[PDB]
Amino acid sequence: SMRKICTYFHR
Amino acid sequence: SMRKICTYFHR
Amino acid sequence: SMRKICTYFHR
Amino acid sequence: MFEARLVQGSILKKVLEALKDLINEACWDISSSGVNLQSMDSSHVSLVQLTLRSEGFDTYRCDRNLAMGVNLTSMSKILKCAGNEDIITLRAEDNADTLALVFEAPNQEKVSDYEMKLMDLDVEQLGIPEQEYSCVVKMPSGEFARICRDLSHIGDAVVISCAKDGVKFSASGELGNGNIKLSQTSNVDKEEEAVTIEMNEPVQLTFALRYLNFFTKATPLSSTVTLSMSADVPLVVEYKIADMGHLKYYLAPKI
Amino acid sequence: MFEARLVQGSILKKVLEALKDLINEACWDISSSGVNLQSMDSSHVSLVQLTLRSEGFDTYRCDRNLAMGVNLTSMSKILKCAGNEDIITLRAEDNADTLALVFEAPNQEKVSDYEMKLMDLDVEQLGIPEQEYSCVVKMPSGEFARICRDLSHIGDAVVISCAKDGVKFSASGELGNGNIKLSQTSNVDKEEEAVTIEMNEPVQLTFALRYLNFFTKATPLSSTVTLSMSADVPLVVEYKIADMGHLKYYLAPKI
Amino acid sequence: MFEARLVQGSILKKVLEALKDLINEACWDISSSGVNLQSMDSSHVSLVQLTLRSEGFDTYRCDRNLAMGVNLTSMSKILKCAGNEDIITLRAEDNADTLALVFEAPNQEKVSDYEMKLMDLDVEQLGIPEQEYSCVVKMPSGEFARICRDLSHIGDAVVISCAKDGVKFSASGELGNGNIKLSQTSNVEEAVTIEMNEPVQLTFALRYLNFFTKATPLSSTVTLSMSADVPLVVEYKIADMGHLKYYLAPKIED
C-alpha cells in the first residue's frame, strides 16, 4: 500500500 | 505585434 | 518483391 | 534586506536539479543561521529537507527571517541560464515579492541578472525528530542512483535488507526478480567507492522506486549518500552538500 | 553545364544544417559570380540570404545562370551521407531537372555519387538595400546561440539594448525577467572570445527568439556572428563563411 | 544443471542489443559444445544464427542440453542492469523454467543476482548448409552500418554490385538516388577486401540490414557473403568465442 509522512511527523 | 519583411524590403 | 528464408533452408 | 554571494554557482543549480522534479512550490526559510527549506511532494508520501549554513557563502546578510515562497520549476529554469563556473549572488528586500538572482562569469566578461516572482504559501512545518536508526548505510551516491534506476526496469518497489555484513536491494517484476547485494568495504577503502554499515538491528523495508529516483537527482551533490532506516518509520536519504550543509529526502514504506 | 569542386566538404553540410530547419524549399541562383540564395520562412517574418563567391571553390564553371529549386530537407538528407573530410563536387546541365552530387574521400578508397530531383519554384527576389546600422555588434557565435537559447526559457521575446559600453539581452516571462549584459573588450588578445560595438546611436529593439534560435543553427560556420540593428528596421545576423562569403539572417521587430 | 562464467560481460549485453530489435522471443540451445540460437523475424524474411563456443567462457558446465525460451526484450532489460566490465555468470537447472544471471563487479564487493522467467517455444530449426559464395566482402562494420543508415534516407532497398576492383551500394528514392563505391584497400579494422568467384548484383530491404547493424559494437569488421537467388549472410565475428550471422532473402519483381 503506502501511507503519508503526515502520519509519521505533524506540528 | 511583429511585421512581415515583405513590408521592410520588396524588389 | 521478396521471399521467406523458410524456402531457402528447411529442417 | 537579504543577500548571499555563493562562489561555487554549480552548488545551487545542482540543488534545484534535485528538487524541481519532486516538488513544484516550496517555502525558503532565511535566517542569520542560513537557508533552511522543508516540503512534502504533490502526494504527501516523500518529504525534502534542505540546510545551507551562512558560513557556506562568501557574503551572507539577513536582518529579519524571510519566508520566500518559490515555484522551483520557475527557479530551475532561471538557474539553467547560469554557467557552472558562475558566481551566483541572491538578493531580496522584506516588502519585496520578487527574488533577484545575479550570475557573474569566470573572469567577468558577462553578467546575467534575473528577477523571479514569489508566491504566498501555507507551510505546516512537520516536526522531524532527531532519532538513532536501526541501520545507517554510507555508500557511493553513483552506485545507489544506478541501483534504484536499474531495478525500476524490474519492478515498482525495492526491498532493502540490511545486516552487519552487507545491504541487499531487491525487486520483483512480471519478467523476474533481482537482488543487488553490497558488502561493508574491506581494505576499508578510499571512501567515495567504499560502503560502511552502522547496524543496531537487521532491517528490511519496501519503498516505491518511483520516488527514490527523484531523490537520486541529488547525486551530483556528493560522491556518497547515507541511507537511514528503522522498521515502520520513514527512510532518510542524506546527500552531503560540500561543507555548506545537506539535503535529506524522507520516504514512507508500504504494507 | 555547371560544376563546382569544393575541397572543404563540411562547409556545405554546415550550410544546409543552418537552412533546412528554417526553410523547406528554396531557389539556388547560380552565376559565374557564384551561388546566391534568398528565401523567407513558412510565415514570412524572417528571411535568409546566402552568398558563396566562385573564387571560394577549387573548380567553378557555370555558363548560363541556373535557378535550381530544391526541397532542402531532401538535399540535407543527401549531404548527411558526406564525410566531413569529403571533397564535394556539384554538377547540373541547363534544362537538367536533376542535380548530381559526388563525395570523394581523403581515403580515395570511397566515392559516393548521388543525384537529386529538383522542383519548379515561384521566387519574389526581395531588394535588400546595403545599410548603415545605428549599432553593429561582433561577438562569439557560441555566446549568442547560448543567450537566445537561455532567454527562450524565460520569455517569447528578447529586447536588445546597445550602447558604447555594451549590449544587453533581456526577456520577460510569467515567471520573471532576465538581463544578460556583455561589455566591449579591451586589449583584445584575439576576436574568438571578444565583443566589439560600432555605435552611431544607442538602440533597443524586440525580436521573437522562436526565429533567432533557427538562425543560431549556423554557429558551426563561424566563431563570431555580427548583429546589425536600426530602430523600426530589421535585425541582420551575419555568419561569415570562411572567406567564400557569408550567410545573413533578417528578422522583423515588434510594435 | 548448467553454469557458464563469461569474463567480458559486455560481449553478452552487446548481443541482446543486436537481437531484441529484430526478434522478440527465441529459443537458446545450450550444449557441452556451447550456446547456439536460431530464429526468423516476425515476418519470416530475415533469420539470425548465434554461435558461442564453450571454449569462449572461463567456466562452462552443461549436464542436460537445455532449450531455454526467452522474451529477449525481458532479457535485454536484465542485461542493461550489468556494468560493461561486469563478469556475467549464467545458471539453469533441468526442470528449471527460470534462468539465473549473476553480475560480479570489478569491485568484487558488489554482486547483482537476477532470475528471469522463460516461456515454451516451438521453433522449426532450419538446416543452414555450408556454402561457397560467389562474392564475400570484408569491410569496417562502422562503414557498413553508416552506408545502410544513409541510403535508408534515399530509398527502401539497396543494390549491392561486386567486382574484382570494388563493391557498390545503390538506392533509388522519390528524392533521388545514390551510388556509394568502395575499393579493395592497401594493408589490412581499417580495410576492405573482396574474394570474388563471379560478379554479383543483389537487392535487399535496408529496413532489415539496419536491424543487423545493431551488432556493429561486436566487431570492427563485418563480412557480406552473396550468391544469386540465395540469402545474403552478414557475419559479425564475436571476439574468438564465435560469431553472429544475419541472413536475408533478396527481392526481384515481375
Author numbering:
A (entry chain D), B (entry chain F), C (entry chain B): 705 to 715
D (entry chain C), E (entry chain E): 1 to 255
F (entry chain A): 1 to 188, 192 to 257
Q: What's in the article?
A:
The CRL4Cdt2 ubiquitin ligase complex is an essential regulator of cell-cycle progression and genome stability, ubiquitinating substrates such as p21, Set8, and Cdt1, via a display of substrate degrons on proliferating cell nuclear antigens (PCNAs). In contrast, CRL4Cdt2 recognizes Cdt1 when bound to the proliferating cell nuclear antigen (PCNA) trimer, through a binding motif (PIP box) in its N-terminal end. Unexpectedly, we found a PIP box in the C-terminal end of Cdt2, and showed that it directly mediates interaction of Cdt2 with PCNA. X-ray crystallographic structures of PCNA bound to Cdt2PIP and Cdt1PIP show that the peptides occupy all three binding sites of the trimeric PCNA ring.
Our search revealed a PIP box sequence from amino acids 706 to 713 in the C-terminus of Cdt2. To confirm that this PIP box motif in Cdt2 interacts directly with PCNA, and to quantify that interaction, we synthesized the peptide corresponding to the human Cdt2 PIP box (704-717) (SSMRKICTYFHRKS) with a carboxytetramethylrhodamine fluorescent label at the N-terminus (Cdt2PIP) and characterized its binding to recombinant PCNA, by fluorescence polarization (FP). Cdt2PIP binds PCNA with high affinity (57 ± 3 nM). To confirm the binding mode of the Cdt2PIP and Cdt1PIP peptides to PCNA, we determined the crystal structure of both complexes by X-ray crystallography, to a 3.5- and 3.4-Å resolution, respectively. Some notable differences in the binding mode are the conserved Phe713/Phe11 side-chain ring that rotates 180 degrees between the two structures and the Tyr712/Phe10 that repositions so as to extend more towards a hydrophilic environment in Cdt2. The average buried area upon the binding of the Cdt2 peptide is 692 ± 6 Å2 and average calculated energy of binding is −13 ± 0.2 kcal·mol−1, whereas the average buried area upon the binding of the Cdt1 peptide is 650 ± 4 Å2 and average calculated energy of binding is −8.3 ± 0.5 kcal·mol−1; these confirm the tighter binding of the Cdt2 peptide to PCNA. The affinity of the Cdt2PIP peptide for PCNA is similar to that reported for the tightly binding p21 PIP box peptide (50–85 nM), as it was confirmed in our assays (RRQTSMTDFYHSKR, 36 ± 2 nM).
